[PDB]
Structure formats: C-alpha cells, structure tokens
Amino acid sequence: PEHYIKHPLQNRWALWFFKNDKSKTWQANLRLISKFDTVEDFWALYNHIQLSSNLMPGCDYSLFKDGIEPMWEDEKNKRGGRWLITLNKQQRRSDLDRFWLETLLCLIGESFDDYSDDVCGAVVNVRAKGDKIAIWTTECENRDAVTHIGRVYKERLGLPPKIVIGYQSHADTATTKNRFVV
C-alpha cells in the first residue's frame, strides 16, 4: 500500500488567487485556482506557481479549507479574525516566501493540535506598502483556540520574543485594534 498510495492530507484545501483590477469589484477579482488533498498534489501545485515575492504588487494568494471562501462574508469567517504578520519592504526579499511556505505547511500539516479545526485558511497580500501574511480562524471569541494558534504560529515562523503580533476581528477590519497579542 505504502509503495504507491499518495499521502492523504487531513483536509482538502483550495488555493485562490486575487489580482487588483480597478475595473472589477473585489469579489470578482478573486478566483479559485485549484484544490488538492494529498501531500504529492500540494507540492505539484506549489512547484507550479509563482513565488509570492514574484507576484505583481496588489495580488493575493489564499489557502482555505475546501468549502470556505477566503472572504469575511463566509459563515466560517464572519465571526472570526486573523493573526497578522506585517512585513516591511525589505522582508519581501528575506522572509516573505519562507514565512508563506511555513504558513502553508502549518495549515496542511494541521500544526495547531486540537485547535486546527478553528483554522479556516491563510492569506498572503503582496503590497507595495508592505506585505502581509495572515492566518484566519473561525471565532474571534475562542480565546484559548486563538491564543494557542498565535503562539504556535509565532514560534513556527521563528519570530523572536522582541516581536509582537496581533489578532484582529474581521468585524473590525470590515469597518484596527488587536483583540489578542502574543
């Protein structure tokens, strides 16, 4: 069996792409690229697409559990929020791709113990003013789930204790105080 079976992931995941085009609404600029649910199909896709540091400014990638769209309006995001990593311009070269890859593996590897069910997906924003990576969770009030995801994420990224990252509710973003910090 092991000799020929692809390795199943715990979840099926959908990778999304967003391109800034002022001719269109934000939702119209969001498109599903493809879905995968094995280790082998994940690397097949990853090795096929541009590194985030090579995208034109204004684009996003999003990796979400199959059935969750990468938007606040989704039932599983409306009451949640995101752990936000704010990159400076120099970190596009030094950290963006490796942070984004680590985040991808954090999602597909289900790295948050028995809180990885609280994870919806992750988003990388390539921006002229400063790139962002975020993990999105489903309930901005599950203090225990959110804080655990945050501490595990900060350490899997390798961020030093001299860095503080914040958790922002989509409800506040969609109208920017942090509700949690680790």
Side-chain angles (χ1 to χ4, degrees), residues 1 4-74 76-142 144-161 163-175 178 180-182:
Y4 61 89
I5 285 170
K6 282 189 305 197
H7 299 79
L9 299 170
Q10 190 72 80
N11 286 277
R12 182 180 282 126
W13 296 90
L15 183 77
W16 305 71
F17 181 74
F18 175 93
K19 174 123 182 65
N20 211 345
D21 178 356
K22 310 179 140 171
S23 313
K24 304 143 53 180
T25 69
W26 180 89
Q27 280 187 9
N29 282 314
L30 196 45
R31 57 182 287 204
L32 163 79
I33 296 176
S34 56
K35 327 172 180 250
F36 59 91
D37 79 296
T38 61
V39 176
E40 295 73 19
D41 295 309
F42 162 77
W43 293 107
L45 174 58
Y46 179 87
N47 294 130
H48 172 56
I49 64 184
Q50 293 286 356
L51 298 169
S52 295
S53 61
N54 254 283
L55 293 182
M56 306 179 50
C59 298
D60 311 329
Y61 284 128
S62 292
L63 191 78
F64 276 65
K65 289 171 174 178
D66 189 9
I68 306 181
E69 301 199 307
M71 72 185 54
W72 316 310
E73 293 88 323
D74 193 278
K76 290 297 268 232
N77 305 311
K78 279 200 288 272
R79 306 206 120 185
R82 66 175 175 180
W83 278 110
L84 187 66
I85 312 309
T86 55
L87 303 198
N88 66 39
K89 308 209 196 171
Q90 296 72 226
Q91 298 178 89
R92 183 160 314 172
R93 149 181 192 268
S94 62
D95 290 343
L96 173 76
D97 297 324
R98 70 203 187 75
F99 281 6
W100 182 236
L101 176 53
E102 194 69 34
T103 312
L104 297 178
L105 303 172
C106 278
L107 301 187
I108 63 173
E110 311 283 336
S111 291
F112 303 115
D113 293 303
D114 315 86
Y115 286 137
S116 259
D117 262 28
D118 268 60
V119 174
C120 306
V123 181
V124 53
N125 307 300
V126 183
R127 304 294 190 259
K129 131 199 179 170
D131 305 314
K132 297 172 275 184
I133 306 169
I135 291 179
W136 287 29
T137 81
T138 196
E139 186 57 55
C140 77
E141 300 292 318
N142 294 338
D144 279 9
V146 168
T147 54
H148 180 263
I149 293 172
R151 309 186 159 156
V152 169
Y153 190 31
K154 186 190 170 160
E155 290 328 273
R156 290 281 308 267
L157 292 172
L159 308 185
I163 299 323
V164 156
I165 61 159
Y167 182 92
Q168 321 176 284
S169 137
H170 301 313
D172 298 321
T173 315
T175 43
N178 290 347
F180 307 85
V181 291
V182 293

